[PDB]
Coordinates of N, CA, C and O in Angstrom, one line a residue:
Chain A
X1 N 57.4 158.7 -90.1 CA 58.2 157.9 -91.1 C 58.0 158.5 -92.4 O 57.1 158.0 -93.2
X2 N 58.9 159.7 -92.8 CA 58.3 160.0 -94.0 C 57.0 160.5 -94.2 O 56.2 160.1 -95.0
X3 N 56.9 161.3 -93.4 CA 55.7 161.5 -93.5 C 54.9 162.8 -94.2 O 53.8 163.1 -94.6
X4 N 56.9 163.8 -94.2 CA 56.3 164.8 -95.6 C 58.0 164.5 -95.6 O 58.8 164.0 -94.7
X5 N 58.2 165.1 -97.1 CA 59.6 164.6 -97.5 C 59.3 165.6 -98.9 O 58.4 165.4 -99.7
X6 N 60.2 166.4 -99.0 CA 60.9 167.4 -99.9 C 61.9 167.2 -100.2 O 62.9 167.6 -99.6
X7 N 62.0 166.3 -101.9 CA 63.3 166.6 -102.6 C 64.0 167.1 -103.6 O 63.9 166.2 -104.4
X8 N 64.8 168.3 -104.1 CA 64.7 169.2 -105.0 C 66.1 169.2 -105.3 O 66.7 169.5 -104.3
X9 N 66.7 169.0 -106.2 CA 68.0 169.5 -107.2 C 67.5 170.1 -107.8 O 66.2 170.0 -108.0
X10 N 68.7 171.1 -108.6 CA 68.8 172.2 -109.7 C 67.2 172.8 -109.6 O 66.8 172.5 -110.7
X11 N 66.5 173.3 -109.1 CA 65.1 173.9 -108.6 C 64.9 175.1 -108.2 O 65.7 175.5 -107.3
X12 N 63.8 176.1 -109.0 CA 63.8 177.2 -108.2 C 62.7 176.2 -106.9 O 62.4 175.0 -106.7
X13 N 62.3 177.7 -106.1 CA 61.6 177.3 -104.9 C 60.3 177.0 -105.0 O 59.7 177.6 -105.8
X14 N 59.7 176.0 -104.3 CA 58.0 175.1 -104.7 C 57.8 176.6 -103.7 O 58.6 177.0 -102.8
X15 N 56.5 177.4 -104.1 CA 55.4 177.9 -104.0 C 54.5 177.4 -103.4 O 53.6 177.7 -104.2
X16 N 53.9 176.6 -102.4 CA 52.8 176.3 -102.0 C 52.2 176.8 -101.1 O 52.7 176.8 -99.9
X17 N 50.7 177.4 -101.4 CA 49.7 178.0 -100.9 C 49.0 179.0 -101.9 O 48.9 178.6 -103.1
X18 N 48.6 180.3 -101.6 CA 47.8 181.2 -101.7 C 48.5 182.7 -101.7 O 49.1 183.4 -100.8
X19 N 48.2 182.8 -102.7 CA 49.3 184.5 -103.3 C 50.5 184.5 -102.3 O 50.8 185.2 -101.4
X20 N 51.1 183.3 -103.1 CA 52.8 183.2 -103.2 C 53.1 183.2 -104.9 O 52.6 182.8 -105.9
X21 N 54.1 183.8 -104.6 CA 55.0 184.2 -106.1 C 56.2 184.4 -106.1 O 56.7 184.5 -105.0
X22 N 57.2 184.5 -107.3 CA 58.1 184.1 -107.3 C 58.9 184.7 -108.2 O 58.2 184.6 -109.2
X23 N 60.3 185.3 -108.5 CA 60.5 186.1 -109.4 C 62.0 185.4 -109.3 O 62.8 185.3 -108.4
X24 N 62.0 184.6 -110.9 CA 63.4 184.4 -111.3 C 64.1 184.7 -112.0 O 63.7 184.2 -113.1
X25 N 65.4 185.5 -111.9 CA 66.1 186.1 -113.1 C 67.5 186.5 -113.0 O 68.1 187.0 -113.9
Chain B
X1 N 62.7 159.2 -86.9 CA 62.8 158.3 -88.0 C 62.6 158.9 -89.0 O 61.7 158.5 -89.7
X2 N 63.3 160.1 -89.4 CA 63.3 160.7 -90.8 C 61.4 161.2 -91.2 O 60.8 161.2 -92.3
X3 N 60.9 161.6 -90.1 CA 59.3 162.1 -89.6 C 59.6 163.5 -90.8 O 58.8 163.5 -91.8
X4 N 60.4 164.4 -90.8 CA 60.7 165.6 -92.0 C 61.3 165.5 -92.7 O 62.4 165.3 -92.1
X5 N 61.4 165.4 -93.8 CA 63.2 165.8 -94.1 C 63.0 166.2 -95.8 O 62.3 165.7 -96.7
X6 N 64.1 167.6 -95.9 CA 64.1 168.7 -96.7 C 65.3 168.3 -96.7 O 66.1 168.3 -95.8
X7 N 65.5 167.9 -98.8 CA 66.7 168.2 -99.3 C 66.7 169.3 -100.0 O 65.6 169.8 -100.2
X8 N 67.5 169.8 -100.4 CA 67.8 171.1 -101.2 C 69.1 171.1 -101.6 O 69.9 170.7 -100.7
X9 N 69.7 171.7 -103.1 CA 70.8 171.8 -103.5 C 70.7 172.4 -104.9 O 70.3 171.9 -105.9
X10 N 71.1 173.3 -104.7 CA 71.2 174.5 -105.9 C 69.8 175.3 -105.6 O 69.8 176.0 -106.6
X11 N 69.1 175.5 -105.2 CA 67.7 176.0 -105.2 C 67.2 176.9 -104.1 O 67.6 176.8 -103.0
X12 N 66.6 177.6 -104.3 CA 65.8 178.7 -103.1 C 65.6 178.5 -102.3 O 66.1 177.4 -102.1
X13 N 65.0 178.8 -101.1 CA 64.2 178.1 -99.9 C 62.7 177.8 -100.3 O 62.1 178.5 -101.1
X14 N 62.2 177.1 -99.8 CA 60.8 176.9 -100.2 C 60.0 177.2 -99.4 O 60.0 176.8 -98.3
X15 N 59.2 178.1 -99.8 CA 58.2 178.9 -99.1 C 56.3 178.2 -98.7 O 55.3 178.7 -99.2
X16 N 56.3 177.4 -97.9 CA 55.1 176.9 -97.3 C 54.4 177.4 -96.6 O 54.7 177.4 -95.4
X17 N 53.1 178.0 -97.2 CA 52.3 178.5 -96.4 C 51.9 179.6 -97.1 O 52.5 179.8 -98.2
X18 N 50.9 180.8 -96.7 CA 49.6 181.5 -97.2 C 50.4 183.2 -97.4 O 51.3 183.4 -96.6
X19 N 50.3 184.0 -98.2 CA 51.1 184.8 -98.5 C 52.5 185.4 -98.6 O 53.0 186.5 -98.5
X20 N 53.1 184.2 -98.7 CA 54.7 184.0 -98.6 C 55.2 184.2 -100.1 O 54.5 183.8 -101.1
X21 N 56.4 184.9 -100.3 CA 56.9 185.2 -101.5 C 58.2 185.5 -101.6 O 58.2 186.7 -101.1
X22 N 59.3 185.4 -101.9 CA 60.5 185.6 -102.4 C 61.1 185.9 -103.6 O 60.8 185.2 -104.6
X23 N 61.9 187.1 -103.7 CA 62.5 187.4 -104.8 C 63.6 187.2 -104.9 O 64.4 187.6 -104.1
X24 N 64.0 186.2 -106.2 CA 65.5 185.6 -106.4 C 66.0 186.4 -107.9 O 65.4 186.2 -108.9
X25 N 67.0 187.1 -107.8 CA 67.8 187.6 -108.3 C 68.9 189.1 -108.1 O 69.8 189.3 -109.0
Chain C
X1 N 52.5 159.2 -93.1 CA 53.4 157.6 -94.0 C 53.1 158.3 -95.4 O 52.1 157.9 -96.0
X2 N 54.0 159.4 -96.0 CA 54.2 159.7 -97.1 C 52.9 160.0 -97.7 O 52.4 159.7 -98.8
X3 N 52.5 160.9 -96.4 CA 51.4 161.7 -97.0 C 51.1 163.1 -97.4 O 50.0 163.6 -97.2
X4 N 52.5 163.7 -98.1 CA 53.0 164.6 -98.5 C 54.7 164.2 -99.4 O 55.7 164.5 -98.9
X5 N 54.6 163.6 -100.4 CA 56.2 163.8 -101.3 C 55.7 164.3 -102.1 O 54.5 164.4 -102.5
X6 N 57.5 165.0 -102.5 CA 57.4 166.3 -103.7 C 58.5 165.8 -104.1 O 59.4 166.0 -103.2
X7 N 58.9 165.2 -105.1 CA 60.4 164.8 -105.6 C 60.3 165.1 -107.0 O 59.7 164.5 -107.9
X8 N 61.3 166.5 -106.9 CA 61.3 166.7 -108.3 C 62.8 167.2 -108.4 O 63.3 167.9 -107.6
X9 N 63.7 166.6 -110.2 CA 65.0 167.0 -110.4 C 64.8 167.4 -111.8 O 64.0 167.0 -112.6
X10 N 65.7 168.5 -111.8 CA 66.3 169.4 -113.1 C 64.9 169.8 -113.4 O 64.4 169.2 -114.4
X11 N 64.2 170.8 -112.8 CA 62.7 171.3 -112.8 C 62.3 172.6 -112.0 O 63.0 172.9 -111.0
X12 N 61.3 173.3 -112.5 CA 61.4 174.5 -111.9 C 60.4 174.5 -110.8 O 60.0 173.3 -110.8
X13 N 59.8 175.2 -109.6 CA 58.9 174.6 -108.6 C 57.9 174.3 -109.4 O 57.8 174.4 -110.7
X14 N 56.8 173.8 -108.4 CA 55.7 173.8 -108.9 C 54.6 174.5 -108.1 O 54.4 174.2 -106.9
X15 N 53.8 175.5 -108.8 CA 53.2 176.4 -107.7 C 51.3 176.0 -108.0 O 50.5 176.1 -108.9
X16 N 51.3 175.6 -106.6 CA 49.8 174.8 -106.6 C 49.2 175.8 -105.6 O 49.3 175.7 -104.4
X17 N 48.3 176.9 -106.3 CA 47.4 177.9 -105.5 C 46.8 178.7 -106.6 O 46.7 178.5 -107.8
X18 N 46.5 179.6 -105.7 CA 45.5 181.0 -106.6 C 46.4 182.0 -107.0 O 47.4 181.4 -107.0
X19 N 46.7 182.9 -107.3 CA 47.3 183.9 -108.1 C 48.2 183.8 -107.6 O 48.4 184.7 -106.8
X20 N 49.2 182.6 -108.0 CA 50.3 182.2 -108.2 C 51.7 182.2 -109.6 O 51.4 181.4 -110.4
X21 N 52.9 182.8 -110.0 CA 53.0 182.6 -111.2 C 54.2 182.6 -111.0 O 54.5 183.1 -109.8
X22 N 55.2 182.2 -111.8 CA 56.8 182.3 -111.8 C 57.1 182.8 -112.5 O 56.1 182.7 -113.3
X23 N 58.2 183.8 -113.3 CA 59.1 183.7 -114.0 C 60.4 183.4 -114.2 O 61.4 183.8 -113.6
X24 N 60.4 182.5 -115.3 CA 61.6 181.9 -115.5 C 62.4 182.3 -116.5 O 61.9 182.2 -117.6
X25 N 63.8 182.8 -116.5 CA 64.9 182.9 -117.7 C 65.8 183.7 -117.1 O 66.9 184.0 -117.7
Chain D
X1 N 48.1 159.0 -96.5 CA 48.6 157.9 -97.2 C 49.1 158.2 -98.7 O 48.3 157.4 -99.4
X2 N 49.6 158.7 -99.5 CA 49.8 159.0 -100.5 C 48.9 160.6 -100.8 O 48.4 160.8 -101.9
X3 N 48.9 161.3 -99.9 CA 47.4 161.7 -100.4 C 47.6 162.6 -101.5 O 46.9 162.3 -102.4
X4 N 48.3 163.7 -101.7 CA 49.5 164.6 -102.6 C 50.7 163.8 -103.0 O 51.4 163.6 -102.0
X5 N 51.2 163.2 -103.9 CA 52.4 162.9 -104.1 C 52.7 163.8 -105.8 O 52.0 163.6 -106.8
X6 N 53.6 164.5 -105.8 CA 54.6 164.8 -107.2 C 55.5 164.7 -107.6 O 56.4 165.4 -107.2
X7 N 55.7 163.8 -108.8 CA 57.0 163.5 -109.1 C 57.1 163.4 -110.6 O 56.5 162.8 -111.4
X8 N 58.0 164.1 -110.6 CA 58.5 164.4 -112.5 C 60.0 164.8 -112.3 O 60.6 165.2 -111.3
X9 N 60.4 164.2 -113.9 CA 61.7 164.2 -113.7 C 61.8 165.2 -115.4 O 61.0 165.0 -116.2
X10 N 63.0 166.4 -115.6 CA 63.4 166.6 -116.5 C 62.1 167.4 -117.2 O 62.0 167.3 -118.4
X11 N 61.0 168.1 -116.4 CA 59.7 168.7 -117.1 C 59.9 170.1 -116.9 O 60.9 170.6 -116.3
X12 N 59.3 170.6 -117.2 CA 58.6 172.1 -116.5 C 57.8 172.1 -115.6 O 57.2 171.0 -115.7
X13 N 57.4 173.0 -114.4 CA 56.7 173.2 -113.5 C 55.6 173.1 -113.9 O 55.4 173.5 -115.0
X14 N 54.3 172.4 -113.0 CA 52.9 172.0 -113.4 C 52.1 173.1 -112.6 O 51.9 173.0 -111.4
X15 N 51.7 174.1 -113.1 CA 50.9 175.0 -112.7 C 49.2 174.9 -113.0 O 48.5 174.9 -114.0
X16 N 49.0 174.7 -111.2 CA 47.7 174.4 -111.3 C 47.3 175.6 -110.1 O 47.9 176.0 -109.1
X17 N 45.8 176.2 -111.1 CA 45.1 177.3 -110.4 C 44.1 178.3 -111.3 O 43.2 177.9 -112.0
X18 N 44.4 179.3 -111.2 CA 43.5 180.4 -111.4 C 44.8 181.5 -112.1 O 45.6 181.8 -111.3
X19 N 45.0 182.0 -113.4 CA 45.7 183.2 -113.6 C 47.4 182.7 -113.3 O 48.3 183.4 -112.7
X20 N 47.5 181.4 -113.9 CA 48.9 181.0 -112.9 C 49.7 181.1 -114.3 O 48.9 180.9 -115.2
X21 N 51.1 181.5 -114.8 CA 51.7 181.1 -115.9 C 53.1 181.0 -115.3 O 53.6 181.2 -114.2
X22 N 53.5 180.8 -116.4 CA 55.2 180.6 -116.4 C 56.1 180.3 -118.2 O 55.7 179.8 -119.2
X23 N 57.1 180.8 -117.9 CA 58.0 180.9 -119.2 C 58.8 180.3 -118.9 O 59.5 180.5 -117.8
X24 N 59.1 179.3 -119.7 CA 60.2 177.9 -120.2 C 61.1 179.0 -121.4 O 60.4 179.5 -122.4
X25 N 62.5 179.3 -121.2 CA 63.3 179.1 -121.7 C 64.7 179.5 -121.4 O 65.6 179.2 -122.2
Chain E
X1 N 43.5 159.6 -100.2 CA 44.4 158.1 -100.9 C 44.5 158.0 -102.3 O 43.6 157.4 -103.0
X2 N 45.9 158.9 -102.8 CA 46.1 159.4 -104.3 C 45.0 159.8 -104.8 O 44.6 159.4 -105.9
X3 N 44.3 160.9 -103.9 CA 43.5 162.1 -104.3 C 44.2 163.0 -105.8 O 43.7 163.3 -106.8
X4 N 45.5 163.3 -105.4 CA 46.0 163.8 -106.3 C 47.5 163.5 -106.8 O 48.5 163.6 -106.0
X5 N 47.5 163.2 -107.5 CA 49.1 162.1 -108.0 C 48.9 162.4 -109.5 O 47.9 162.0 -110.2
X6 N 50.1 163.3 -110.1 CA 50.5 163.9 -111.3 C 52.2 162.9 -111.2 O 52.8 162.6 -110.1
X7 N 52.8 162.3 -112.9 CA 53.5 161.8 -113.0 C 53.9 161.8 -114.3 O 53.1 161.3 -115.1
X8 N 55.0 162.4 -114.6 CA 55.3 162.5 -116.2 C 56.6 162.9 -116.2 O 57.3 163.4 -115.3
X9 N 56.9 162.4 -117.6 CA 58.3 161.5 -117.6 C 59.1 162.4 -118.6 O 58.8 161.9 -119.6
X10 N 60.0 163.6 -119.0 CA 60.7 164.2 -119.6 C 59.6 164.8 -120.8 O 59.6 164.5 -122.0
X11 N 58.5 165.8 -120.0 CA 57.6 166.0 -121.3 C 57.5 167.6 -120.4 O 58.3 168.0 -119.5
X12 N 56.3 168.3 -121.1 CA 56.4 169.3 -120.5 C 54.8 169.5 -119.7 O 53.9 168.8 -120.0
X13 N 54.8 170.5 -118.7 CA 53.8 170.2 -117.4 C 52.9 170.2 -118.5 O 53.0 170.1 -119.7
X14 N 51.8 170.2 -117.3 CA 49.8 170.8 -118.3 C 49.5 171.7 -117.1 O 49.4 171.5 -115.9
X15 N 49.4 173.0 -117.8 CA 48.4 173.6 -117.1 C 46.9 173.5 -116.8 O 46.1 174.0 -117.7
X16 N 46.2 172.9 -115.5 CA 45.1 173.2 -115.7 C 44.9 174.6 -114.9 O 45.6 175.1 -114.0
X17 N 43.7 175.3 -115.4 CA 43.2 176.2 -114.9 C 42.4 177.6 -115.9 O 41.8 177.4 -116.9
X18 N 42.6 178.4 -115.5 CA 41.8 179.7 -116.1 C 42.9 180.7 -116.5 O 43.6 181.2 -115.7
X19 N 43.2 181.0 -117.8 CA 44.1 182.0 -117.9 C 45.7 181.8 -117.6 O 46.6 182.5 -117.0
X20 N 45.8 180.7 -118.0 CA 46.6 180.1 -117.9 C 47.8 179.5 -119.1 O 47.4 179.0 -120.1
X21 N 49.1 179.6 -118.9 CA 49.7 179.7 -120.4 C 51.3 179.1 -120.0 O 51.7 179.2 -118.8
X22 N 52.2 178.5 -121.1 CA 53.4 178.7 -120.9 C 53.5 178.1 -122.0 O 52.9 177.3 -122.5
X23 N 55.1 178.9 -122.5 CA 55.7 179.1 -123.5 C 57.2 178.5 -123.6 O 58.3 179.0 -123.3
X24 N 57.1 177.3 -124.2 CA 57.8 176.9 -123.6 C 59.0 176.5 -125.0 O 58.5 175.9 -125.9
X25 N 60.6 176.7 -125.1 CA 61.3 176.7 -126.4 C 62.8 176.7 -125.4 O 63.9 176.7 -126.0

């Protein structure tokens, strides 16, 4: 029930962890 | 019962987990 | 039971690790 | 039970870590 | 059990960490 829940408008992308990166342009 | 759930709208994919990376543009 | 939300709007990710970084523009 | 939760509205990305940055504009 | 729970309202993030920066305009 909800137990992970991701919510994102107008958003670059969540990064989560360890040597993640991200290039916006 | 809604156990995941990923919204997204205008935005990247989201990258979860250990050396993961994406380039946007 | 919402042992993981990430609710974020009009915002850029948020990168929770180690040599982690965005660029944004 | 709550154990991670993030929620901001209308911010910049909250960069937490080691060598992490990002550019707002 | 809200080990970690960040919440802010139209301001801009806080970086914690080492080497860490943003520039934000």
């Amino acid at each position: 029930d909800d137990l992970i829940k991701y919510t994102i408008f107008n958003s670059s992308g969540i990064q989560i962890g360890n040597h993640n990166y991200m290039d916006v342009g």
